Write an enzyme that holds these catalytic residues in place. Structure first.
Site, PDB file in Angstrom:
ATOM      1  N   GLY A  68      35.815  44.605  52.029  1.00  0.00           N
ATOM      2  CA  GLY A  68      36.630  43.801  50.737  1.00  0.00           C
ATOM      3  C   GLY A  68      38.138  44.384  50.091  1.00  0.00           C
ATOM      4  N   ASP A  98      33.255  38.518  34.173  1.00  0.00           N
ATOM      5  CA  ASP A  98      32.922  38.809  35.263  1.00  0.00           C
ATOM      6  C   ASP A  98      31.869  38.424  35.516  1.00  0.00           C
ATOM      7  OD1 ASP A  98      35.297  37.828  37.341  1.00  0.00           O
ATOM      8  OD2 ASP A  98      35.776  39.663  37.188  1.00  0.00           O
ATOM      9  N   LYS A 142      36.195  52.065  46.746  1.00  0.00           N
ATOM     10  CA  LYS A 142      36.726  51.847  46.461  1.00  0.00           C
ATOM     11  C   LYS A 142      38.642  53.038  46.028  1.00  0.00           C
ATOM     12  CE  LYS A 142      36.536  47.968  42.933  1.00  0.00           C
ATOM     13  NZ  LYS A 142      35.249  47.604  41.654  1.00  0.00           N
TER      14      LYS A 142
END
Lengths: 298, 257
Positions: A11, A127, A33
């Site tokens: 991603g 979220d 990340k």
């Protein structure tokens, strides 16, 4: 970082990029990340500051485990447990057959357990949407992406620029409430529950006002009896069309009475009267819950 | 409310695990309580100047006291610790923080961007990213629900007293945030309404009026002495009508405990 082998990109993600990787010493499969610094200027991003400090307090089976943080002078890395995919890709892949109801129930049960734990540890996720919900072959589901999460030991203010995508956004927020509350997370879970069930987003708005009016057409335009205060809210206009509450049998046909009941309480207009994660878990709909395994394509 | 009890329980667990070393200023070779008091007072001004929340200031102070609990710091670097702590606290709590350039500017360029950022990284390493510390504010917020009814002057005054405890490492480092909040609240409630720490809050906290006494006695003394005190920025902040003038209220002369 020398012990990690890039396997593949998984991603572009809340800036910058997210890689599947393998620990070369232990064989642990992991998600990385990468944050640049650069940053751009301005130090450790606020978003990573919250993500790390909150998620490291949140050790629970339905919450994506943060494994490590490697802090160079020039680069910052969050290392997470690895899960094969997100709910969005799985709903997508399941379009033809649908997600079986007992796995819907397992998932929703599991999401509420993770979310109860967030809430009991004074964290708001803010979220919750299907791409931030991660699943494995053994039939677990976990909350992920805590970029927008916030501690609420003191009230959390609303902010135009740090907000869930439109479709999973609670009516409080669209109407301009000053404070977030736990109820915004339940709302989002409610929308997702219905989406798994019907195969169709429940409130897919083109815009803030479109989002609101779609909510209104299904649940009816709220008035002061349903939701004390609603008229006085900042982005309440008295020009709002006054729609009437559609029959719930017609909005989620596949569900029984227990399922309709739970969803009704998750989509309650008034934030104080919206069911809590903890109370949701005690709903009769989870009476007979099991833990099926999905068929994942990858 | 489902989760409110659990939050409180957890904040009680966590406040014990972010406690500073109570004795740290004695082991700290180049700095003192009065140097700390100055810095914190300045942080109050900085918070007033950029319109930061009160929680932000309380967090920064907690960060600073934890860092100094395990790091030697020369005098001329203390403000760099303080600045980075404020910057970190802003990123955690503010809706968006001020920019780093501002935090450089507010030092009179006695440091540089490079230094402030390098210290941000250091504070983060020394605190192991454990930024979500309970504060007296978090505990006051929770206690304020046990008012019958809410009274905005009682609230403002508790927050004032709370914010004063930040300044004085002696004696306020020896008290947990939940206990300072307990005292601040009772003292405000007595000053404004003449009521006491209510039965509901005894049941909630386990704290009796007896238990809060040492903190109260000290807090009272601080309240009494506040206008003679060397740093004033907080008394200033809380004469404003935002806070219902509560810093101008006259403390009682006795608590009659």
């Amino acid at each position: 970082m020398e012990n990690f082998q890039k396997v593949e990109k998984i991603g572009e993600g809340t800036y910058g990029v997210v890689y599947k990787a393998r620990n070369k010493l232990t064989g642990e499969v992991v998600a990385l990340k990468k944050i640049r610094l650069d940053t751009e200027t301005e130090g450790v991003p606020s978003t990573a500051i919250r993500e790390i400090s909150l998620l490291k307090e949140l050790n629970h089976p339905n919450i994506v485990k943060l494994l490590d943080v490697i802090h160079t002078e020039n680069k910052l890395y969050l290392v997470f447990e690895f899960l094969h995919q997100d709910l969005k890709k799985f709903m997508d892949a399941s379009a033809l057959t649908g997600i079986p109801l007992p796995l819907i129930k397992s998932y929703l049960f599991q999401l509420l357990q993770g979310l109860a734990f967030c809430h009991s540890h004074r964290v708001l996720h803010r979220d919750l949407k299907p791409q931030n919900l991660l699943i494995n072959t053994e039939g677990a589901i976990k909350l992920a992406d805590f970029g927008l999460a916030r501690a609420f030991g003191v009230p959390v203010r609303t902010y135009t620029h740090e907000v869930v995508t439109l479709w999973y956004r609670a009516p409080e927020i669209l109407l301009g409430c000053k404070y977030y509350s736990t109820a915004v997370d339940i709302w989002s879970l409610g929308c997702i529950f219905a989406e798994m069930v019907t195969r169709r987003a429940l409130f897919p708005g083109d815009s803030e006002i479109d989002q609101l009016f779609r909510i209104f057409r299904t649940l009816g335009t709220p008035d002061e009896v349903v939701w004390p205060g609603v008229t006085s809210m900042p982005d309440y206009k008295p020009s709002f069309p006054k729609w009437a509450r559609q029959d719930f049998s017609k909005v989620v046909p596949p569900l029984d009475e227990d399922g309709r009941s739970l969803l009704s309480q998750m989509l309650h207009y008034d934030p104080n009267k919206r069911i809590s994660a903890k109370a949701a878990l005690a709903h009769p709909f989870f009476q007979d819950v099991t833990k099926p395994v999905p068929h994942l394509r990858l | 409310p489902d989760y409110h009890e659990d939050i409180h329980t957890y904040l009680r667990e966590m406040e014990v695990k972010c406690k500073p070393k109570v004795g740290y200023m004695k082991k700290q070779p180049d700095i003192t309580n009065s140097m700390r008091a100055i810095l914190v007072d300045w942080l109050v001004e900085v918070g007033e100047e950029y319109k930061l929340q009160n929680e932000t200031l309380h967090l920064a102070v907690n960060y600073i006291d934890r860092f100094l609990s395990s790091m030697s710091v020369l005098r001329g670097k203390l403000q760099l610790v303080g600045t980075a702590a404020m910057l970190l606290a802003s990123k955690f709590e503010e809706i968006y923080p001020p920019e780093v350039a501002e935090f450089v500017y507010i030092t009179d360029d006695t440091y540089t961007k490079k230094q402030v950022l390098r210290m941000e990284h250091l504070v983060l390493k020394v605190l192991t990213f454990d930024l979500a510390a309970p504060t007296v504010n978090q505990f006051l917020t929770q206690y304020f629900l046990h008012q019958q009814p809410a009274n905005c002057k009682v609230e403002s005054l508790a927050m004032f007293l709370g914010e004063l405890s930040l300044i004085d490492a002696d004696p306020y480092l020896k008290y947990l945030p939940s206990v300072i909040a307990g005292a601040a609240f009772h003292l405000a409630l007595y000053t404004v309404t003449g009521q006491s720490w209510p039965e509901s809050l005894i049941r909630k906290t386990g704290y009796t009026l007896e238990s809060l006494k040492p903190c109260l006695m000290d807090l009272h003394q601080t309240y009494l002495k506040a206008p003679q005190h060397a740093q004033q920025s907080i008394r200033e902040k809380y004469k404003n009508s935002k806070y219902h003038g509560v810093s101008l209220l006259n403390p009682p002369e006795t608590l009659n405990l």
